[PDB]
Every structure is written in structure tokens, then in C-alpha cells.
Symmetry: C3
Subunit: 145 residues, 3 copies
Amino acid sequence: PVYMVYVSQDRLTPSAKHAVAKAITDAHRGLTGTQHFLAQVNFQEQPAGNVFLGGVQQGGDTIFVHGLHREGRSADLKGQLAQRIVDDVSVAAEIDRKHIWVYFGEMPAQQMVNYGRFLPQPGHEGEWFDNLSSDERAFMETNVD
Amino acid sequence: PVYMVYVSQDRLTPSAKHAVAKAITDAHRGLTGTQHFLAQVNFQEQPAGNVFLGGVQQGGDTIFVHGLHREGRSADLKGQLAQRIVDDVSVAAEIDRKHIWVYFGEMPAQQMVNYGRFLPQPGHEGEWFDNLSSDERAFMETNVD
Amino acid sequence: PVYMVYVSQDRLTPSAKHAVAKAITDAHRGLTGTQHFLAQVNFQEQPAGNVFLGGVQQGGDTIFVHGLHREGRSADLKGQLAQRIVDDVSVAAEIDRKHIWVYFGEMPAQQMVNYGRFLPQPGHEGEWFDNLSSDERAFMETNVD
């Protein structure tokens, strides 16, 4: 996946970011079986005060996670995945769950690419990896924590 | 909703950003009936020259509103709301309508989280607010302008 | 279309950004027939190290392109468009393809707005353009490279 994580500048240190990225990568990997290296977590920082709720300028605690997935998973699974992102990001970032927003968007995997290659179905995988080139697998492999 | 508003650095003063978040919120509240505090407006500033139109580097006037919505509203209502954002952001930003881009993407409510709580179906916002705990209600209410 | 291009700060020179913008814009025009000026490319820069892959902090080479399209085109055409973006952005940015991530999200053209006006369906740009007002046509024509 790609997780776009919109946060305010400075609210997360480099170690909070890694912590926030590990909590999200673990949830997605744990609940969908997708391998570690296929989860991209992309932090988008903006100055505090660029977030408004009900037209009221916010401080710098709001966290919005926009997850871009392949279609084909159940509402159950997606429900569990989002709840675990709320819980586990709350822990990692040391924020109150009342600051955490999470939207999952789904596209067909036919029109999705990571590492220059078209993704599998969630009902494939493994064999998509083993069908990649060895230099391709190798570069992917350096991306596991 | 979550409205990501892509503007150029310093195109919108702090005062201009507040009036724009206010316009967007008031349009979405007035046309869908969701409470103000559920309306998030997240400004994404980037230096001028990061927008290209047909390969022509642009100055800092272009505004892209990306609206993230729950599924279930008519094409009619979505039409009216998009037009009202164009007009109302134009006044609030004092910007000709020709610079304004607005896209609405929709996702099932069951995979969408708001203040750490899953959203109801559209039209069911009052029963879902009443169901919230007292501290959660009070906290949301602070976010109303 | 709107192409949000996520890259680390200073990874792209101002001329490489033009070349990536041109590469995407000519890909989209070539295969969809949409006029040059309807292609928006919006660079979203972040400091290097805000991207994680499998929990591993990255340098500034990763490029994620999130294309936002109208519904109505075939899986096959979107496959060719995605592959072409990978190939030609690779060239224009001097970045190996394996750093490049491409996702296409689709929406009904009835809830999408370019230059203050609603898009037509994916067959009817010419007649849509011809029926615009003469100042709008003139403004759109300026954004062609």
C-alpha cells in the first residue's frame, strides 16, 4: 500500500515517524498478508494551523491517514485494519485517538504500480514476488524492518 | 469530510485560509447537513512553480480542492456542492473561477474514520453524534466556527 | 487530469520537473486524446526521509504519482498509460523505474471540475472545449508546451 500521513511540521520526530510507519506497516502486513516491503508510508508535513476543523484553525496534533488499497477485501477486514491503525498510531505517535482520521480508498490492482511493476490481486501474491527478477526481489528485500 | 486544498506558498494569507476553510465548510454543511465539526479542511502549501498545466509551469494562483466523501449522495447534490465550492472559494480567496479545480472521491462509510470513530451513513449524523460519549461530544463541539 | 507527484525536496531540478510534467502530460494526451491544457501536474515536495518502505527510512529517490481520472476508460488503456508513465518519468527524471509508484483513481466526470467548469465524458473534450466561452478558451490555450 501507499499510506499518505498528513501531519504538522515537528509534531513527529524522526523516531516518532519510524514508530508511526512501523505501526501502520505491521497492521497492514498482519491483517492482509502483504509482505513488509510493499507498504509505503509517506509523511506529508505542513505548518501547524494549516488544518481547520469546522472552520477552526487547529494546533498540530491532527493526524489524517489516507490509505490507498487494491480492491477485493471485505468490509470486516477493512474495518479491523482501520481500527488497528487508529489504536496503533495513537500509541506510536503518543496522540489521543480523537485526533486520528483514517480514509481507505480502493482502486483495481490492474491500474496500480509499485517498484515499477503492476501489483497482484490480494488473491494472488507470493507467486507475483517469485515471478519478479532476482535484482528486483533483491532491491525489495532491503526494505524490511 | 476531508478536503485537501493544494495552494501555492503565501497565495493565501492566514486570513484568506480561514475564510476559505469557512466557505468550504459552510457549503458542505448547508448542502449535506453534516455538522460543521465533521468538516476538515487541510491546506497543502507548496512553492509556486510546482504546478504545471499542459507542461507550462504556473504561478501561484491555481487551487486544487480534493474532496473525500462518503458514498451514497446523488449526482445532483454532488453537482450543486462542487459548483458552490468553486463560487464560494472564489469569493473567499478573491480568485477568478478559472483557477479552481475540484474533485470528489467517495468510499464506503465503513472504512472511514473521523476523530477516531467510524462514520455513519450520510443523513445519519445526528443519531451518531448522540451516540457518542460526553467528552467526545464536547471535544467535537469546540471545532465549530 | 490531476497528477499529484510526490518526491523529496531538491531531488528534482526545476528543469527535471518540467520534463517529468511534460512526460506525464504527453502520455495522457497521446493515449486519451485529452488536450494538453487539461493535464495538471502538481509536485508535492517533502524533505527526504519522510518516505518509509517496509518500515525502512528512504533517501530522496522514491516517486509516487497519484493520477485522478474520469471513469470510462478500459483497464487495458489504463495499463498502457500507467506503464508509459513509469517508463517516461524514469527517463525524464533520470531515476530507475523501481523507485516509481503509480496509482490511478477514477471518479465520475459529473463530480469533477477543471478551470471552474465540469469535465465532459472521456470522448467529448473537443466539443466541450468548443462550447466554452471565448475568454475561457483563450486562457486554457495558453497552457500548452
